[PDB]
Amino acid sequence: DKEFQVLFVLTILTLISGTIFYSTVEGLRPIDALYFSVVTLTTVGCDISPQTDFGKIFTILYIFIGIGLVFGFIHKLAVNVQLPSILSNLVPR
Amino acid sequence: KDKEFQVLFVLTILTLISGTIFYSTVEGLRPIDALYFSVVTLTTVGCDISPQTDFGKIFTILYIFIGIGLVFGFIHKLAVNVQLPSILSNLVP
Amino acid sequence: DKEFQVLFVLTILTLISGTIFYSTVEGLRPIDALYFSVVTLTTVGCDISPQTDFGKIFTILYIFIGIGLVFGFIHKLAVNVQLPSILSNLVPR
Amino acid sequence: KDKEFQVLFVLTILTLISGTIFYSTVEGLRPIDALYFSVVTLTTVGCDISPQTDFGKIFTILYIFIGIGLVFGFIHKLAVNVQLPSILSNLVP
Ligand SMILES: [Ca+2]
Ligand SMILES: [Ca+2]
Ligand SMILES: [Ca+2]
Ligand SMILES: [Cl-]
Ligand SMILES: [Cl-]
Ligand SMILES: [Cl-]
Ligand SMILES: [Cl-]
Ligand SMILES: [Rb+]
Ligand SMILES: [Rb+]
After folding, report:
1. Residue B5 exposed, middle or buried by CB count within 10 Å (0-12, 13-18, 19+)
2. Across the interface, which of A3, A10, A67 has its CB nearest the CB of D75?
3. What is the CATH number of the domain that holds D68?
């Protein structure tokens, strides 16, 4: 779906921005920055908190701005792709 | 009916099994702790443990994106086909 | 609203059950058990995880069963009470 | 329009201010850390810190119940009146 693609591109770009930020300012390895971006914007959460005042402020802003994006993408991911595939199997061809 | 709900239940169970196996082997958690990690992640509660392997972080990211929509679709249908019915149905003479 | 009251009574009973369980099996002070019940069922999360296998299993079950209840109550709390009061102030009597 | 959205924005800001003041005085957090705690709690991300005073736990429980609906209503309207419009409006010739 076109909208689903827009939401994917936006989500990936958001997670790239978060990865870059947290690997630079917080000194995280990229994978750790990606994990933190993912677990922050999806609201799962992790065992670590940001240590720089700049990191804390950015995380606040990143949450409010990316949370809705990531959950719109999760909704479309579940609805235009995961649940329907299984529901195609409910009819025995 | 409770036919879609059954589908979401089986999908959620298999998802939690996959997470259980994954986190028990790669992260060395006991199976109950792997099931707990799978459950608290996909429900977004989270916990004070975080994966230690780069493989575990990559998998957890993908597991989050794919399984939040299933686990919460299951919770939604559990509320709409089992919880909401039993309450209202009892709010009658 | 009648339904709002049903949801409150259910929510309070749920948090009582969780408080009792976690203070007995996990040895938490009641307030700590109440905090854990609250932060678990609302998905905020805390810095501690359950330590007993029994505690872990119960938390899994408690999440799936109480999560929908607590968020239905949060919705009605925001919608039949908090947001509307403020919206009554939007019209200058 | 963006009139209800403005109301949710001001309510969210005042809620975050209240949390900031509360957690800075009773829990001895720096103000930025109190703002962070308020923000990650009400967005349900959570963090590795937990309140130490019994007063802080009681307040946090009430703050969660009252402010999740506001903070997420604000995120919903931010997505529906600011984020969804700017994307689609740009998905035109
Ligand atoms: Ca949520
Ligand atoms: Ca946490
Ligand atoms: Ca921790
Ligand atoms: Cl890396
Ligand atoms: Cl075992
Ligand atoms: Cl106590
Ligand atoms: Cl300061
Ligand atoms: Rb959460
Ligand atoms: Rb969380």
Report:
1. middle
2. A67
3. 1.10.287.70
